[PDB]
């Protein structure tokens, strides 16, 4: 059994569309346990100034009970069957999924449908969650990494929809109405914009059957079955500096505009990010790590950690890096980090990509380690590519990448571009934008 053969012998992903426009996909295995859920193409980006934080507010009630079954009843039923009910809401994507015994795939599907369609939106529960959410905002306000990424979007996409955070504003949370949440749900949780995904030991035909039975409510007009294209979010080379010398370490995030899901270049960017990789003070590897930046970080004690990223979206994305450092080592870190980015565009090696490619393969294989992670892939894939992409296709694409390709693609999105910068904490040593902007050319 060779890597290739194992990739080809992986069960295919089945997809079937209902008349209402919903899509049902699943990957079959021989596991007594499974995961199934509905991936909705909704999120903060779809909200506006008045209902920002609604999709999040909803994410809080999506588990507090439906019309057919109030809170206690809803919970008991799920708990008593050993099933796990989780989910999340992001900027362009939302999800509600359940982990359970394949033996219950059908009852689950019924439960899912009931959650996405008949949420009780208990008037009293709403005021109760209003206070919970407000506490979660204070908890997250201490999460530098997330404060930093929020700020990164706040400036990189200033003036637009991606600038908003997923959780929403304090004013919105304090005044969102039972009607607003309701409106949100009806406006966005719609068949053509949803995907019923499942993985494990399940019959695609049994899945699609229960699907037909519970995901009904078809649409009449044309405006109800058309998936709205969102208005473009303008990228802006800029920076937001939130200084507080009272914080122990500083977080910095720099990024250029990314291509967006459908673009093939993304395979190259991910290889590129693989070369620079990531690091943190507990990587036993130490000073021998392959990632040059990681090596320098260790030798010069440049940071506590650093990480690259290539966040995608429908029509845009953020390609960059983030690091945490002591107030006195920020400048050298940023220096080396930008240095490496220059190296990418200019002097990438075949060896470098050979390694990065292997690293990338095992990384994609890791994101399919369990029923939930695989289910997440399916949901996301159909929702972003409108079709599942096998590990064999990815590997096909990854294999085509070479040093020259990395250089051209990287030169394309990085070289001499105006980045977006977010710095939080004791950031006095971080030099100005103009200085950083110069680190964008020559290497």
């Amino acid at each position: 059994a060779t890597y290739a053969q194992t990739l080809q012998n992986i069960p295919e992903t089945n997809v079937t569309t209902l008349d209402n426009g919903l899509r049902v996909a699943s990957e079959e295995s021989s596991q007594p346990t499974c995961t199934v859920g509905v991936w909705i193409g909704a999120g903060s980006r779809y909200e506006n100034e008045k209902n920002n934080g609604a999709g999040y507010f909803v994410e809080h009630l999506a588990f507090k009970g439906t019309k057919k079954r109030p809170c206690a009843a809803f919970e008991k039923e799920v708990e008593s069957m050993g099933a796990h009910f989780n989910g999340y809401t992001s900027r362009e994507q939302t999800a509600f999924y359940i982990k359970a015994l394949s033996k219950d795939m059908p009852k689950v599907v019924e439960l899912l449908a009931d959650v996405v369609q008949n949420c009780a939106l208990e008037e009293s529960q709403i005021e109760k969650e209003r206070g919970v959410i407000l506490q979660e905002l204070k908890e997250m306000d201490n999460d530098m990494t997330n404060v930093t990424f929020d700020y990164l979007h706040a400036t990189a996409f200033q003036g637009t929809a991606l600038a908003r955070t997923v959780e929403g504003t304090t004013e919105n949370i304090k005044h969102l109405t039972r009607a607003d949440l309701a409106s949100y749900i009806d406006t966005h949780f719609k068949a053509p914009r949803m995907v019923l995904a499942a993985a494990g030991g399940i019959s695609h035909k049994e899945l699609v059957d229960a699907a037909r039975q519970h995901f009904s409510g078809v649409s009449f007009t044309y405006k109800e079955d058309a998936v709205p294209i969102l208005p473009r979010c303008r990228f802006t080379g800029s920076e937001i500096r939130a200084r507080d010398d009272a914080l122990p370490v500083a977080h910095v995030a720099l990024a250029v505009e990314g291509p967006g899901w459908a673009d093939p270049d993304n395979v190259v960017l991910h290889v590129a990010n693989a070369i620079i990789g990531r690091y943190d003070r507990t990587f036993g590897g130490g000073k021998h790590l392959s990632s040059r930046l990681a090596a320098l970080a260790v030798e010069h004690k440049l940071c506590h950690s650093f990480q690259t990223f290539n966040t995608s979206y429908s029509d845009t994305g953020l390609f960059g890096f983030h690091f945490v450092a002591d107030p006195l080592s920020i400048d050298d870190m940023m220096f080396c980090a930008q240095g490496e980015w220059m190296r990418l565009c200019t002097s990438t090696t075949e060896s470098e990509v050979k390694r990065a490619k292997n690293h990338l393969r095992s990384a994609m294989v890791a994101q399919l380690d369990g029923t939930t992670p695989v289910c997440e892939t399916i949901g996301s894939h159909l929702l972003n590519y409108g079709r599942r992409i096998s590990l064999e296709e990815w590997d096909s694409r990854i294999s085509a990448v070479d040093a020259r390709m990395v250089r051209d693609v990287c030169s394309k999105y990085i070289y001499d571009k105006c980045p977006a910068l977010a710095a939080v904490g004791p950031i006095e040593q971080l030099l100005d934008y103009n200085r950083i902007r110069s680190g964008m050319y020559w290497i």
Binding site: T155, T236, G237, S238, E239, I240, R241, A242, R243, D244, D245, A246, P327, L328, I330, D331, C418, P419, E428, Q429, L431, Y433, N434, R437
Partner: protein
Amino acid sequence: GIHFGNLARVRHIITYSLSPFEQRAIPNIFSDALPNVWRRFSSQVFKVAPPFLGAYLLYSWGTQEFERLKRKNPADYENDQ
């Protein structure tokens, strides 16, 4: 020699800037620049100008006085014969 990083203890200040390429080099010349040049000029003219005006006068006088004293005084030859 090396100072960035140990200058001041600062807290709770956010700043926002744009790349030089996203903005205009010399914006709002008429709605902002000139109006301000006028403001600035105005708020200083009566501080600066005055002493220089006086210097100018003293100059004008002293110069004219010097030349005046070079002229002839007809009353020095009235009864000359």
